[model samples]
Target: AARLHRFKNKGKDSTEMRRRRIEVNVELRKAKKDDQMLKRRNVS
Candidate 1:
């Protein structure tokens, strides 16, 4: 019989990092919030 229940993923990892493109979670969030500011800053 199955014993010592441990939490296991029903689906094994497709979390943000596993995607085809790289995604830095914090950086992306910050960039999203400051989209215009960052974009303009890049030009100068």
Candidate 2:
């Protein structure tokens, strides 16, 4: 999310914005996975 904000603030081209969007999405997915793992660990 921090990177996403930085990229949006400094991006000079649409391609850069698009690339950062993809990266943000990947990060979000990983965060979600980590959250799930933490939840499972708490349950155990």
CA lDDT of each prediction against the hidden true structure:
0.58, 0.81
TM-score of each model, paired residue for residue: 0.27, 0.63
Q: Which stretches of candidate 1 lie over 4 Å from their true place?
A: 1-23, 36-44
Worst 10 residues of 1 by lDDT: 3-12
Error of 2 at 30 (Å): 1.0
lDDT of 2 by residue, 1-44 (tens): 45553665564578877998999999999999998998989964
Q: Give the root-mean-square deviation of each candidate in angstroms.
A: 7.6, 7.4
lDDT of 1 by residue, 1-44 (tens): 65323336433455533652455666687778788787878953
Q: Give candidate 2's TM-score.
A: 0.63
Best by TM-score: 2
Off by over 4 Å in 2: 1-11
